[PDB]
């Protein structure tokens, strides 16, 4: 299952995942893709911020769905 991850500046990347994968996992894949620490990542979907615990299949994330990624730099 291919999904999109887009920044507020429009910078977008593509991730192969599954509905089973959790938020921490896609965050890990983000870290693996572009090297962004999972601790700084804030993902958003349907106008709501996502919790690290739940999975994509909870937030009704279909294929080719776009997640909004904003960064929270520590300090």
């Amino acid at each position: 299952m291919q999904i999109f991850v887009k920044t507020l500046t429009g910078k977008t990347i593509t991730l192969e995942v599954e509905p089973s994968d959790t938020i921490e996992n896609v965050k890990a894949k983000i870290q693996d893709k572009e090297g962004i620490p999972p601790d700084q990542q804030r993902l958003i979907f349907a106008g709501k911020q996502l919790e690290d615990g739940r999975t994509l299949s909870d937030y009704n994330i279909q294929k080719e769905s776009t997640l909004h990624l904003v960064l929270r730099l520590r300090g």
Binding site: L8, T9, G10, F45, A46, G47, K48, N60, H68
Partner: protein, 317 residues
Amino acid sequence: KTIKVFTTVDNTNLHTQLVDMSMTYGQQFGPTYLDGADVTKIKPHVNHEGKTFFVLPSDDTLRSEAFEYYHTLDESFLGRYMSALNHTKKWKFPQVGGLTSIKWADNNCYLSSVLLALQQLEVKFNAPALQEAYYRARAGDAANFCALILAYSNKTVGELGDVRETMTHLLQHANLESAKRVLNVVCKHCGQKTTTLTGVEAVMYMGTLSYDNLKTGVSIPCVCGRDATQYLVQQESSFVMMSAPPAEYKLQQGTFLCANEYTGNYQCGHYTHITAKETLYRIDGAHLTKMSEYKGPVTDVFYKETSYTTTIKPLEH
């Protein structure tokens, strides 16, 4: 009896709604707005058919759209936005010195200042609404922009304000991803200690108006008693804002881009804008004053930039 209307959150997606004329809009869409007017409590007229309505996001699509439009998660944004807009729509935005200003009203001098300043800066806004309103403002129609500025800053119309804070709150939504600043602190025996900053934090400074003083050195108190020297190692950005508590400062022709003066005390004060091209132009709302040089209580000074590397070298003591 029903009526067909449209509800939206981004002025782009118009969602069709068969409104019940018996009930009010409030009982259906929630808090509603028709061209800035809160019609949440009034019932639907036949006059209102085909017209576009602004609502708060009440489902996933509207929430998604509204977020994609405003780049904020706060669902109450539209309310403050419209509340401010109802007032900013009345302000007059004359063209002064090839720039859009605002006639003094409702303590809008700091808004006028950030507007004038922003027009002279090379910046991109990441929030569609903000960018569009910005373009419209540069064109001459800046009501929506001001309203949005007030919205994003959690400030209401009439309230006095700080230009620096507003600038921060705005640049939050600006495209400064590639903006990079690295600084270096050196003591007598504590050696060299470098620091890196990005985004808004990489184009803002509060301690000196001088940009050069940041390149030369700034005396900051350190651990081991003796004052340490802070200096700018590298500055990769389009511009730099140098701020400080309101102090008497002499502005010169080819030393900066623009600046803000704050006259008064911490109780109440008045802002004035300074922009430099041929001579020095002082913008006070709708009023303009040409000048050779300005000596006054200035708080914020803007400098243009591209990419800067240093001459400085450390000495491991």
